[PDB]
Every structure is written in C-alpha cells, then in structure tokens.
Design a protein around this ligand. Structure first.
Ligand SMILES: Nc1nc2c(ncn2[C@@H]2O[C@H](COP(=O)(O)OP(=O)(O)O)[C@@H](O)[C@H]2O)c(=O)[nH]1
Length: 257
C-alpha cells in the first residue's frame, strides 16, 4: 500500500527533527504549486508499505484573511490528499499549540496529534494524562521525543497500525454560542458535498478564510459577508474565546505538576 501523510504544526514544535527522523536522506525540496514557497517531501518504507510525506511550513493558525504560509497550510489542509494529517505539538506549550489543533479537528479529516519534547516536559516535572487528552480532542494522541531514534522507530509502528485500522474520530463538542451557531447553520448548506465537513467550511468562511471565500461565486460571497455583518460581536475574537476556553478546560484535566 502507499500512504500519503501531511505534517503540520507551529514553528519550533520539532517538526523538522521528526521529519528527518522519519525520512532520513530520502527527502526532496521543490515548490508549492502556483507560488515560490519551498515544498519539502520525503518517503520511507515500513513493513512493505510506502509512506509519502509532505511537510507544511510552520503556522500558528489557518488562514483568516488577514494582512503566505497560512494560505499554503489552509490550502493543503482543505484540499491536499492525505490518509492522515500528523499535527506535531510541543507538549511544553499546550495552550498555544492546540489552537491550530482545534481548527484541524473541526475539518474532520483523519489526523493524529504527536506530542513532541516529552523529555523537556519531564524536566519540568509536568505529567500529562494522555487518555484524557485523547478524550478532549477525539483523535489519537501519540507522545514522544523526536530527538530519540528508538521512539521514532516505535512511532512508525504505531502510525502504520493506525493507518491500516483506519482512524476513528469523535468530533469535538465545540459550541460557539446560539448566535454564531445560527450563522453556521445558515451557511452550512452551501458547503455540502465537499471533501471537508460543511460545518468546518462555514466556520472558515465566517473567519474569512481566503481559500474558502475565493472559490465562491459573487452571490455566495455576498451571502457570506452578510452573515458576517449579522454577528453583533467580532468574529475573530469570538472564535478565539471559544477555542481558548475549551483549551483552558482541557489543560485543567490533562496537566498535573
Ligand atoms: N528537548 C527536545 N527538543 C527537541 C525535540 N525535537 C526537536 N527539538 C528541538 O526543537 C528545536 C526546533 O526543532 P525543529 O525540528 O527545527 O522545529 P520546527 O521549526 O518545528 O521544524 C530544535 O532545537 C530541536 O533540537 C525533542 O524531542 N526534545
């Protein structure tokens, strides 16, 4: 079998180190289609199957129509083939890193969260309840130190097994309030029959994600910008408050000193 993998995370998560650990010398650098941003790909073989990896440039959030990397990441997460998205997270910086994790989880594409730098976490005497973390995120969570070649080889076994099983998702109970949820419900029908959850596309449209908006006909686009004006409060602040509230609750149940 040939499996397609996308790797994504904040800058300084250890993504390059993990990528190198997985692929070694079998890496290439080219360009993302349409632009001049470098595109890194790699591969490895494990137990007879091929794993084709595409790295995404490090970003802290998906595109929200503000102000190139965020646009490339949004494009790939919405439209690039992948049997699984690997979200690399710095375990010592959970509240900030898991912001993009929640945006990725809303898409409902198969994904796993890799908590990196568990060795750095141990030095701080912090313990993470990984079963609780899996419960809050609704996707598999694997923990490691990507600077450890043995843990990366074990990760390959676990990743291969998950890909063969198929990844079981429980979608996140993120509720944005009666008002915003009514706007989501209003837009969802125009985003049906797409490769990604219609709910997630409606939220991204309201967040003004350029990859979503750019594909809309003028009348669709007008309907989106109308529902944006219907929101009594600032959408970017609204969705951040909802996401960071959830993450505060997550960290209270997962993180112990
Ligand atoms: N303590 C620790 N540091 C790590 C680990 N993986 C990466 N790092 C360090 O994190 C920093 C950034 O790693 P890098 O792979 O370049 O991050 P990237 O920007 O996400 O690609 C580097 O100093 C790495 O050596 C790990 O498992 N444990």
């Amino acid at each position: 079998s040939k499996y397609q993998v996308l790797t994504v995370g904040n800058p300084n998560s250890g993504k390059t180190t993990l990528f190198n650990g997985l692929t070694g010398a079998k890496q290439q650098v080219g360009n993302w289609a349409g632009v001049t941003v470098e595109k890194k790909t790699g591969s490895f073989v494990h137990a007879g199957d091929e794993f084709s990896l595409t790295d995404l440039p490090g970003i802290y959030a998906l595109d929200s129509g503000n102000d190139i990397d965020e646009s490339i990441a949004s494009r790939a997460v919405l439209t690039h083939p992948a049997d699984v998205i690997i979200n690399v997270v710095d375990a010592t910086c959970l509240e900030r890193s898991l912001y993009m994790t929640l945006q990725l989880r809303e898409l409902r594409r198969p994904m796993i969260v890799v908590l990196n730098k568990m060795d750095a976490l141990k030095r701080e005497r912090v313990h993470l309840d990984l079963k609780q973390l899996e419960a809050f995120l609704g996707c598999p969570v694997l923990a490691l130190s990507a600077n450890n070649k043995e843990q990366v080889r074990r990760f390959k076994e676990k990743l291969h097994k998950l890909l063969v099983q198929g990844i079981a998702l429980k979608q996140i109970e993120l509720h944005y309030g009666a008002e915003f949820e009514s706007l989501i419900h209003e837009l969802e029908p125009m985003f049906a029959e797409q490769a990604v959850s219609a709910r997630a596309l409606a939220i991204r449209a309201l967040e003004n994600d350029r990859l979503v908006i750019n594909g809309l006909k003028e009348a669709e686009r007008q309907n989106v910008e109308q529902r944006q004006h219907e929101c009594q409060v600032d959408i970017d602040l609204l969705v951040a408050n909802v996401r960071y509230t959830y993450l505060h609750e997550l960290c209270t149940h997962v993180r112990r000193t």
